[PDB]
């Protein structure tokens, strides 16, 4: 993989790289001057030569190509795919810039969460983008921090004598939504398994089915992150999962309990689980009913917590659509002259 990539290295006779942006499972992301659009920056993603990823990226880009011709304008702030080809075998995308990713800055910002007036914009354009392809019969599938990434990532720091640390603010906190690698149309074939540990729905853990809803889990999930600065699911395990969700959400509901054929996770009508055990403990200590979180009584707070309580409804059918997240009043404040 590197031994396909080094700065100075010319791809398709109009790429030159000049930075390396990232790195991932997929392989690297590095910026490059394309020499025949005026020297023009842009991101190219380089896939590693494993077929399950050759696979993802043959799939991104037949959605982005559809993406791009139905929103030109982009309006609905998906990235932009520019082209894409063939560098020793290995697939390459061409996407518009974009900054580091919403995980990035938190990360790089001291695992601080974002002010709650960039949370209310972030939360609108991501729900905005992905909601665009809902009405387009696709679920991304993938939803995390990592796949929001800023167009401009340019930042203000001063210290914050509230929390006795540096705080690094942004100046354009807009953000655009990446890797369509997993994205699903409606009529094609649902994968059992989707999402990242942390931002699985529960009807995708226990193989119930799922489609558009599962995405607003994630993003609930998200705005989650982005207000305390780590996630609320810190596991890998899927049955752990479940009882944190226990402890925060409430019990499962009964139907969806009875209708999984994963009945490993269950003993009759309640979770398998030792509340006294390594994981058990864990859970006690590190997990509380969600509204407990709130560092705020702020009337904004509590219509934000709202919202993240609609879109983390366990019944993926009552599960607020995000057509409606966009007409929530946690967004009132951004329709105001
Ligand atoms: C530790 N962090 C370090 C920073 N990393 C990073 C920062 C900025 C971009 N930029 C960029 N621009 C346009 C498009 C894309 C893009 C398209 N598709 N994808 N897919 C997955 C990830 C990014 C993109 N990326 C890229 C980076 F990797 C992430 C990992």
Redesign the pocket.
Same mark, same amino acid.
Do not use: R
């Given at each position: 993989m590197h031994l396909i990539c080094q700065s100075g290295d010319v791809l398709s006779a109009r790429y030159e790289i000049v930075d390396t %942006?990232? &790195?991932?499972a $997929?392989g *690297?992301?590095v910026?490059c001057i394309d020499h025949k659009a005026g020297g023009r920056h #842009?991101?190219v *993603?380089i896939v590693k030569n494993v077929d399950r990823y050759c696979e993802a990226a043959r799939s991104?880009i037949q959605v982005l190509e559809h993406l791009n011709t139905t929103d030109p304008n982009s309006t609905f702030r998906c #990235?932009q795919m520019l082209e894409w080809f063939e560098h020793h075998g290995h697939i390459c995308?061409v $996407? &518009?810039?974009?900054? %580091?990713?919403t995980?990035?800055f938190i *990360?790089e910002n001291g695992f601080l969460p974002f002010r709650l007036d960039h949370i209310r914009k972030m939360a609108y354009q991501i729900c905005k983008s992905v909601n665009f392809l809902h009405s387009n019969k696709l679920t991304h599938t993938d939803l995390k921090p990592?796949?929001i %990434?800023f167009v401009q990532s340019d930042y203000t720091e001063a210290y914050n004598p509230k929390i006795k640390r540096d705080e690094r603010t942004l100046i354009n906190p807009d953000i655009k939504v #990446?890797?369509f690698?997993s994205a699903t149309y409606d009529d094609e074939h649902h994968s059992t398994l989707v999402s990242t540990r942390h931002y699985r729905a529960p009807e995708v853990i226990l193989a119930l089915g799922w489609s558009q809803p599962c995405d607003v889990w994630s993003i609930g999930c998200i705005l989650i992150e982005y207000y305390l600065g780590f996630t609320v699911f810190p596991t890998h395990d899927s049955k752990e999962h479940l009882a944190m969700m226990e402890r925060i959400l409430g019990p499962l509901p009964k139907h969806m309990i009875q209708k999984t054929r994963k009945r490993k996770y269950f003993h009759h009508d309640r979770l398998d689980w030792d509340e006294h055990s390594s994981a058990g403990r864990y859970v006690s200590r590190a997990c509380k009913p969600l509204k407990e979180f709130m560092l705020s009584q702020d009337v904004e707070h509590e219509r934000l917590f709202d919202l993240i309580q609609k879109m983390l409804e366990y019944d993926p059918a009552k599960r607020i659509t995000l057509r409606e997240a966009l007409k929530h009043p946690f967004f009132d404040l951004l329709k105001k002259s």
């Open positions: %942006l990232g &790195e991932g $997929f *690297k992301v910026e #842009v991101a *993603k991104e #990235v995308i $996407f &518009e810039l974009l900054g %580091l990713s995980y990035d *990360k990592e796949n %990434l #990446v890797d690698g």
